[PDB]
Structure formats: C-alpha cells, structure tokens
Design a protein around this ligand. Sequence first.
Ligand SMILES: CC(=O)NCCCC[C@H](N)C(=O)O
Length: 116
Amino acid sequence: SMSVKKPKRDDSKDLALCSMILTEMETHEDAWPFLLPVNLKLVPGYKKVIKKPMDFSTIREKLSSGQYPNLETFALDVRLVFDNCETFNEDDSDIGRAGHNMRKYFEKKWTDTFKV
Ligand SMILES: CC(=O)NCCCC[C@H](N)C(=O)O
C-alpha cells in the first residue's frame, strides 16, 4: 500500500528476454501459421468471429516499439495467438496441432525464464 512495497524484482532484462523467447517462437518449424496476420479478406468468418486477431509479427512490432507495459501484457498477446487458433481450427488439423505444440513450447520457456 502507500510506502509499503515488496522487494523490487529486477525487471531490467525482461525486454531482452521476451525478445529471445519470441525469436525462438518465430524459428520453430510449426510457427508458420502464426508468423503473419491472418488475411481477413481471404479467410471467410475470421474477422467476424475472432474479435482480437494476433500474430508473431504483430507481437514483434509491439515489442520493439515499447507497447508492452510489462511481462504479463506480452504473455497475454502470445496466449491470444493460440486461443484464437483454438477458436477457429479443429484440434485434428495441421494448424490446430501447430497451435497446441507452440503453446506448450511457449509456456515452458515462460516458466523456465521467469519462475525459475
Ligand atoms: C492460423 C489460423 O487460424 N488461420 C485461419 C485458418 C486457416 C484455414 C486453413 N487455410 C485451412 O484450410 O484449414
């Protein structure tokens, strides 16, 4: 509360660390469905259904331009990519399997990096 704070976590490396994680996401062989925005003119239903589209290039742009106030807002965008994927694609589809794989991949990195 006022004048009463938990010990200050060193947040000085977060930006570099999230960049690293994102670079690992981008180079994974199953990233291809998530590298660029879904093309809303060419994918019927997507615009109507998926209220907040998100993709790795957009996350990258937001990151490099200081648009994530903190760690968690970055994780929320990454998770949104996979929540969107789940909403639109069947689990038993190539893109549905990519999404599950990439989420698992992300959450382990997230844990190893920010929760020891
Ligand atoms: C990443 C994502 O959800 N893209 C939209 C779904 C694409 C559908 C794909 N072209 C298909 O044929 O199943």
